[PDB]
């Protein structure tokens, strides 16, 4: 077990556990430091770390040491014995807390036992040299006032107090002659600068910190975790694996890019969590190999070490046994040490992926920042770590007795204020970028708030190198994971070999490199007239010396005037917010504007389903003007067009290497070796794909996802400024009143704040979901495809390479050069589907990915929509769309294909989309309007089949075609095998619901079936089991092709494709979504229009029509005439019959030209009687429950109702609509609905029943029933003349 020692600063020096040490960087000169051995090989020096610093640097200046830390200064820390002792007692408490759990004890045990090798690169393989500054440190044995006598000792860790910046903890290693033993397998004395009172503060993004912007927000760190984070560095340094490699460097070419030090993989491994995924698998292996090579040199030394000149006392055997166990080397019967691959593997992973800040936090139930790449807030001072009421060895701050265990309450700044103090800002220093405009006017932005964008150079191009494939060659994958459970239960990790005595010969060679630090400007001034995220966020603030402000939608006035603040909320919200009222109305106004704030913020949940976008936060553009000037125009629209890319401040230049060639080595006459090779080249091929994916993930995380992070924070800040501004205004208006009035004003400022804060949290959640959605979108559509492209090119190049190989050895393969010839094709046929979870196990990142893949709309690989008189693909995959001259396009997304050759659309699909799922799994949806057959051309109509959409590549693919009243879907696999499914509508109906009328089509394909849906309902099915591979990513041609009549045309709308089979539910939903409109429709399915002649149709009496009765002002109902010719294939009822009606608008006299009819509009229903325009009327005073409508010339009579409100009571899609007569617009008094009534007529001559055009109250209740009665006599449809229908 581990034993923590105990002592007080004032305890006497005994030259054993309390000594006068001579620190490595002292170079054998200068005074000594009283040091205490807290545990074996570990020392604590309770004093400021001054090595490499200037005495003045300890004071706060206009400089800074690190560009990414809100630095705290206080040169008095540790300036008295009592302060030192407190430092000591605190370190002791922390070490005890660390060992309070297995995982911590083991980390400590590994460190104590991980003694530095005796020597470094300069030392001969046969020697042990303790006389170097990385192995031995001295202690002054003689009395005070003279360095006369000194003894050398071995040591693993020396922990000092903090350097200039107290909250800037760092673990330091020893360099000698430009080299580091702690980076080359040896390990070396580690040093640390640590401060336990002043800890970091972090605030979880997707999470709330007490859920309230008005209270302190965030969480403070458990110093024990901060210490264990440093200890992990020590561990790495002690085992000599703290190696360097290709780092993550930030791009600093643009002014909005965050500037900072290069981040080594060793750092990200130490943090754990998602950070390791920012290190490409390529670089993971580079490091792996470097460490393994270091261990080989050390293991070779153990087989050659013979003596130790520096210290005649060193027992050669004892150390050989210690290092053998330290490095987990395998000995052998003779004493020959060698490396065991399994054991090495386990040790390496334990050190780089087991002991991580992330794993230790989860284990000690301590909260920490979600990622290394997270904004850094101001640090706080812990009041008293030595007070068990605030901090305990067992639980830290999260004490269950104080009910501070759940949700890390003890670390919550808004909840555990009795545990910490805020810091005096006048002691903090941060690196800022002073953004100035060319005039002058400047805004300060903390470097921390900028976008961190990894530069291209941060990534390895090892994928572009060639590789030799031999019967040997095997695949190599490094797991950035490690089961902490086995690590904690591991029985051999922790050594049980004697720890050598720490006493040895004094160090005489003080040669060592000592770092030199120095501050740099805390402010860097740049020039830019750009008004991006920083300026926009600024426009939303106001000086502390101003209390009277007014909101404005004008960004420019907001910057110009200090009393004007910018707001991205609605114009109505801004006017109300600036409204000044009487004290007697203040309360009302407060509730009103606060309620508005919530509604405005709540718009973050806006849907845009018609555009195949479930979530959109319309105001993000106005809020930050981030990326491609998203503050101009309509964001939603600009988003539907370019998508997530428009939100990025910068489009990274990705590194996507041309995968190196495979040099295959052949073995003549060997049936086994030659084969083994091929198989290995196959598996190695997979390592290439995976490695390419990891390369992408790493770039996505450090160049893209970081930008979206900055945007999420930007919105949290923007929404916050808005709440505070409203807070300011309210405070100001209230305080204008007298105390007498305030007493009678009913306001609860805590309720106002509670509601404002709630609306914000609700918005933050939407924004987070939205933004994470975008980020994953960019990964899958803008990054994965560019990689798939290369990998596919590599495959082909490898395909021939392998065949040509199975070719040259066709001899030494005899009757098998074939069995594998295919093996190569069938293998390079199936590709590896991307899976983010393979490159990371971070829960948040996985949920983002799964959430994305569960949204059916992300399966759209083509979506042709209209934009600026043209069709473009808005799927996000960038298909090229060529629309030729013979195609007609309207802004209602309708496109017409005619008989002319130039009436076609060429679509070149994206070749890099995993479409070939290996069984055929995709859907196609679209609306179509197919004209009626010409009566004089029925024969050709039912006989000639013609293609309309063709997608073929290598005589394989799919096709949509038409033959008369039948639409057909056809599949053709690579073998030329064909399967079809079709939907044919009847052409002998009095009234067809399809002929020349818009309707929704949906075709789905899965391994077994090809199904066709019409208007959401399944119509046909075809077993497609035999069909083999079908190539569907070929070019798509929209064009009427076949033996068609010159007049033959076709209308289509919303053509889209999904790389998956849609369910009956997804389809029914798409039908409803695409059917929706504010306006009503006409019989054909087009928008109902004002001032357009229409014949009237009645869904409750199909074959009936209205006619003005000869002798009376009523409309009789006659039977529609039918198809007179003699064909046996056709039958219908005339539609161009009866009166010709025309809908007139009731309000705003903007003339009588045209316009769309919208639900609930008030109209006049007129019609033409010869050369005059008449109107439909209702006698106001009828007592019966229905009467004949009154048709007569246009006139104003107080005895007749002439105003109609066009309605839509059906909740499901329909082209029918209803006509309601109301007393007047305002009145809720309903007269009745227009329909048809049968009356009995008995005259001196004729006795019969006759139907008339009527109004009736009966329908009022009928239209409320569910499901909606489509047969009701009050359901009408308007039919206008249409080239698609001739009778
Ligand atoms: C126990 O039934 C009733 C009791 C009291 C009042 C009522 C009714 C009633 O059944 C009823 C109706 O069925 C209808 C109407 C109605 O007003 C009432 C009552 O007031 C109105 C209607 O005739 C229209 O002209 C619509 O524009 C439609 C409908 O008539 C049906 C039957 C008619 N004879 C005719 O066949 C018509 C075409 O359909
Ligand atoms: Zn670190």
From Swiss-Prot:
| Motif placement: Host ganglioside-binding motif | 1256-1259
Q: Where is this region: Translocation domain (TD)?
A: 440-853
Cellular component, GO, one term: host cell plasma membrane
Active site: which residues? 230
Q: Which UniProt keywords apply?
A: Disulfide bond, Host cell membrane, Host cytoplasm, Host cytoplasmic vesicle, Host membrane, Host synapse, Hydrolase, Lipid-binding, Membrane, Metal-binding, Metalloprotease, Neurotoxin, Pharmaceutical, Protease, Secreted, Toxin, Transmembrane, Virulence, Zinc
Result of changing residue 1188 to M/Y: Decreased binding of heavy chain to host SYT1 and SYT2 independent of gangliosides
InterPro entries listed in its UniProt record? Bot/tetX_LC (IPR000395), Clostridium_toxin_transloc (IPR036248), ConA-like_dom_sf (IPR013320), Kunitz_inhibitor_STI-like_sf (IPR011065), Toxin_rcpt-bd_C (IPR013104), Toxin_rcpt-bd_N (IPR012928), Toxin_trans (IPR012500)
Q: What class of enzyme is it?
A: hydrolase
Q: Where is this region: Belt?
A: 477-528
Q: Which effect does the record note for changing residue 1186 to L?
A: Greatly decreased toxicity, heavy chain has decreased binding to synaptosomes, binds less GT1b
How does the cofactor bind to this protein, according to its record?
A: Binds 1 zinc ion per subunit, to the LC.
Q: Where does D-galactose bind?
A: 1236-1237
Q: Where is this region: C-terminus of receptor binding domain (C-RBD)?
A: 1076-1287
Specify where the region named N-terminus of receptor binding domain (N-RBD) lies, as residue ranges: 854-1075
What does changing residue 1114 to D do?
Greatly decreased binding of heavy chain (HC) to host SYT2, whole toxin about 200-fold less toxic. Significantly decreased binding of HC to host SYT1 and SYT2 independent of gangliosides; whole toxin about 100-fold less toxic
Q: What GO annotations for molecular function exist for this entry?
A: lipid binding; metalloendopeptidase activity; protein transmembrane transporter activity; toxin activity; zinc ion binding
How does its activity get regulated? Proteolysis inhibited by EDTA and captopril, and by peptides that encompass the VAMP2 cleavage site (Ala-Ser-Gln-Phe-Glu-Thr-Ser and Gln-Phe-Glu-Thr). Translocation of whole toxin into neurons is inhibited by toosendanin.
Q: Where does Zn(2+) bind?
A: 229, 233, 267
Disulfide cross-links: 436-442
Subunit architecture: Heterodimer; disulfide-linked heterodimer of a light chain (LC) and a heavy chain (HC). At pH 4.4 in the presence of ganglioside GT1b may form trimers. Interacts with host receptor synaptotagmin-1 (SYT1); interaction is improved in the presence of gangliosides. Interacts with host receptor synaptotagmin-2 (SYT2). SYT2 interaction and toxin uptake do not require gangliosides but are improved in their presence. HC interacts with a complex including at least host synaptic vesicle glycoprotein 2 (SV2) and synaptotagmin-1 (SYT1); copurification does not depend on glycosylation of either protein.
Q: In the UniProt entry for this protein, what further remark is given in the free-text comments? A: There are seven antigenically distinct forms of botulinum neurotoxin: Types A, B, C, D, E, F, and G; new subtypes are quite frequent. Botulism poisoning is usually food-borne, either by ingesting toxin or bacterial-contaminated food, or less frequently by inhalation poisoning. In both cases the neurotoxin binds to the apical surface of epithelial cells in the gut or airway. Toxin undergoes receptor-mediated endocytosis (using a different receptor than on target nerve cells), transcytosis across the epithelial cells and release into the general circulation. Once in the general circulation it binds to its target cells.
* Family (UniProt): Belongs to the peptidase M27 family.
Q: What is this protein called?
A: Botulinum neurotoxin type B
